[PDB]
Design a protein around this ligand. Structure first.
Ligand code: ADP
Ligand code: ADP
Ligand code: ADP
Length: 748
């Protein structure tokens, strides 16, 4: 309760380099801290200000952190303080903390900033014994002894720190690198242009690799897996092969830290020389640099910051004199608290691992998804397909339902990995209306050329179901020889999937296996924590929310009521509501009585009266049939008659050809591969009599992200896990957030 951090005060601090999201993190720490009834002190300019003092440590006020969520970089400012690397420095800062009573330290930094704080709470003890030779009164110390616990949120655009699935800013970083390539690409038309982007990457190929998977990079260079002997030619033959195969351009991403087998760095510029001294085409080089670090923070990063924030402050109060250092982290999509040292003493271990030419090892400590992205990437950018024909299983891929950003990313993968396996792959136009009307065709390796970035649905999707036309489809699945189905779509994908099983009872043809890759703006599919194209939507809501809000700022003291999409699923609403820091986001999964609405409006008002000048009120397009937008609006209006102005617009259904964000492109890529892979199997094990017959419920699935790993779940199994009238899954991880969303809004 709010009786947790009373008689307790904490110092927050950025350190290291600006990472879009640090502000949101700070804000969280400030507010949740003040909320725990504790006191929060700012401490400007990284570890410096802590070393310095007085003027560098103002006390934080609630209002102090508004207008931050969306602001790039750090407002509490960061520095590089070399002073802190030595004891004297600490003696100095530690002095400054005990002088103000602060006993809790929040450090939002990185591999370094972290290990600094790390090796501080460490030898803090004697630091006190030392401060007693004169320093301060042993009385202001007696009761401020062994309780200086510290936690550390990892900000970092290179996302290298070991232990967390995402560091703050890297999504944003990814966005930047993408926007460029996005452009660098949509207009290179004019000669076989060959770009050479050099992205951030000390001793970490993450942004490097990922940017390559989204762009459809022709070649990459990553620290952890050096090209070893040969290659120039490899890359030439490559860039050369693709030349004849037809191509407007080439993109060769290069991690900064790009080295060769021997450690003697491969230079972006050198790559350029090569590609020209050999095949010679206008080959240019760009070196993004310190921009990747700016721009405004993405929904994810705004959100990740808020989450880590609270996790930090909590870890800070629940702290103890018998507990080790905390490093809140995202993991399996749930916040964890990992031991600081363990983390650092490891994240470090990956560099050594690399120092010694032990890259297989380096690649190991990175392990996770990394290794996959790697293998999957090489595969998809791959030279080309081997010897086809023969008794190759043939699969069909289709889209079903409302369109999404990522569908093309998914289809492209599904097909390619398909051909890499040696299987035939048909492509279906217009979801189920497809096998039915029979608009099916074979997809060659190019059919999906550079789709990865294209939004909307190249293939065509319709949310119509299949039952009413099994005759037709079964007829076609028999004529085209479809013997496996990969369905990319949303609730109708799942729903039409269940509709398939039933068919297995009446039709032999239907007795093939099928996977369902979730692609829905709304994130309403049972089976996964995230569908594809959700971020892309969620990232557009956020944007225009910020616009609407931070606009017409002339009228001053005004409130906006915004209605987001998502049917009955209040994911978008809830998430955006938290990313654009709205005072309230009325969603369906959490019913509200008018006694609430009031308590809620008799609340924004008390704010529009004092501190705040702009109000944000988000409402799910279905949170409730009577308390309509128009209801909420007028209620919010009248009630704020004197005090403020207020307008209300309905975003409605947009993102027509909305280009998928780096994350959706990746998510949609990792999957369509993971499925065409899994399907290779089921078609294998479902063959028995020179016929293929799946009639188990192991075939026919929905592939979803489940707190930590993808899992093929059987449709029939999810049924009692899903509300069908509202078309929303029954368990929704994110409802767990609402509270933290109401906290940052200063409620309860
Ligand atoms: N080993 C260390 N001991 C003490 N402070 C450190 C250490 N490493 C880094 N720092 C501090 O972290 C801040 C920035 O270091 P950097 O190496 O840039 O960390 P990061 O990679 O997390 O941004 C500076 O205040 C620096 O003094
Ligand atoms: N845009 C995002 N929206 C939601 N979660 C995200 C986003 N970006 C990263 N994450 C989180 O980071 C986790 C770990 O990512 P990871 O396994 O390394 O794959 P990638 O290499 O695609 O990040 C994702 O599974 C997800 O939980
Ligand atoms: N797109 C790419 N970017 C960077 N390296 C690549 C790419 N594609 C292939 N390679 C590298 O080519 C080398 C050989 O490719 P591989 O698939 O192992 O077949 P083979 O070893 O017979 O040439 C590997 O080191 C692989 O990492």
């Amino acid at each position: 309760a709010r009786t947790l951090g009373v008689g307790k005060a904490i110092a927050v601090l950025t350190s290291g380099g600006d990472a879009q999201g640090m502000n949101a993190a700070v804000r969280a720490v400030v507010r949740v801290g003040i909320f725990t009834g504790a006191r929060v002190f700012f401490v400007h300019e990284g570890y410096q200000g802590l070393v310095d003092g007085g003027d560098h440590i103002r006390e934080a006020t609630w209002e102090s952190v508004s207008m931050m969520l969306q602001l790039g970089g750090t407002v509490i400012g960061s520095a590089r303080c070399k002073d802190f690397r030595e004891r004297e420095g600490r003696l100095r800062a530690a002095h400054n903390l005990v002088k103000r009573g602060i006993t809790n330290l929040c450090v939002i930094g990185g591999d370094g900033s972290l290990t600094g704080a790390d090796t501080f709470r460490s030898e803090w003890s004697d630091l006190l014994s030392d401060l007693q030779k004169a320093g301060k009164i042993t009385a202001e110390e007696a009761t401020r002894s062994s309780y200086l616990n510290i936690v550390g949120l990892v900000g970092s655009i290179d996302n290298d720190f070991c232990g967390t699935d995402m560091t703050i800013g890297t999504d944003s970083a990814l966005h930047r690198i993408t926007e460029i390539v996005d452009a660098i690409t949509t207009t290179a038309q004019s000669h076989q242009r060959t770009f050479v982007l050099e992205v951030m990457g000390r001793h970490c190929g993450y942004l490097a690799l990922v940017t390559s998977l989204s762009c459809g990079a022709d070649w990459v260079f990553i620290p952890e897996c050096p090209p070893d002997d040969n290659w120039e030619d490899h890359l030439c033959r490559r860039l050369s092969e693709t030349r004849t195969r037809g191509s407007r351009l080439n993109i060769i991403i290069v991690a900064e830290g790009a080295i060769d087998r021997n450690g003697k760095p491969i230079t972006s510029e050198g790559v350029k020389d090569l590609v020209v001294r050999r095949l010679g085409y206008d080959t240019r080089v760009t070196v993004l640099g310190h921009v990747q670090r700016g721009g405004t923070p993405s929904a994810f990063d705004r959100i990740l910051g808020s989450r880590m924030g609270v996790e930090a402050v909590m870890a800070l109060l629940e702290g103890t004199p018998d507990t080790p250092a905390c490093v809140v982290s995202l993991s399996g999509n749930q916040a964890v608290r990992l031991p600081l040292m363990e983390c650092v003493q490891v994240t470090k271990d990956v560099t050594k691992a690399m120092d010694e030419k032990r890259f297989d090892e380096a690649m190991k400590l990175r392990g996770r998804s990394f290794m996959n992205n790697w293998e999957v990437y090489k595969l998809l950018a791959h030279i080309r397909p081997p010897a086809p024909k023969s008794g190759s299983y043939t699969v069909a891929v289709m889209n079903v339902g409302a369109p999404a950003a990522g569908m093309n990313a998914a289809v492209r993968s599904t097909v390619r990995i398909g051909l890499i396996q040696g299987n035939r792959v048909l492509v279906v136009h217009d979801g189920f209306e497809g096998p039915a009307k029979g608009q099916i065709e074979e997809a060659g390796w190019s059919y999906v050329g550079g789709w990865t970035g294209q939004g909307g649905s190249k293939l065509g999707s319709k949310r119509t179901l299949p039952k009413k036309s099994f005759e037709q489809i079964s007829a076609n699945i028999t004529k085209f020889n479809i013997q496996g189905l990969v369905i990319i779509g949303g609730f109708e994908a799942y729903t039409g999937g269940l509709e398939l099983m039933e068919g297995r009872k009446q039709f032999d043809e239907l007795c093939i296996p099928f996977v369902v890759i979730p692609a829905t703006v709304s994130n309403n599919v049972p089976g996964s924590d995230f569908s594809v194209g959700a971020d892309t939507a969620l990232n557009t809501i956020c944007t225009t929310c910020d616009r609407i809000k931070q606009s017409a700022a002339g009228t001053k003291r005004r409130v906006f009521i915004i209605e987001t999409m998502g049917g009955y699923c209040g994911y978008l609403a809830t998430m955006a509501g938290l990313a654009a820091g709205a005072d309230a986001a009325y969603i369906f999964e959490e019913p509200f009585t008018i006694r609430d609405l009031q308590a809620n409006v008799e609340h924004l008002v008390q704010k529009m009266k004092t501190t705040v000048k702009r109000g944000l009120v988000l409402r799910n397009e279905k949170c409730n049939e009577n308390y309509t937008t128009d209801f909420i609006f007028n209620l919010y209006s009248e009630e704020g008659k004197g005090i403020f102005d207020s307008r209300k617009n309905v975003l409605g259904h947009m993102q027509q050809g909305g280009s998928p964000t780096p994350f959706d492109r990746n998510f949609a890529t990792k999957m369509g591969a993971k499925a065409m892979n899994w399907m290779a199997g089921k078609i294998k094990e479902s063959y028995r009599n020179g016929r293929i017959f799946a009639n188990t419920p192991d075939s026919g699935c929905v592939l979803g992200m489940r707190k930590r790993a993808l899992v093929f779940q059987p449709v029939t199994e999810l049924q009692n896990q899903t509300d069908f009238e509202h078309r929303i899954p029954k368990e929704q991880w994110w409802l767990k957030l609402r509270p933290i969303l109401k906290i940052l809004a200063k409620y309860e």
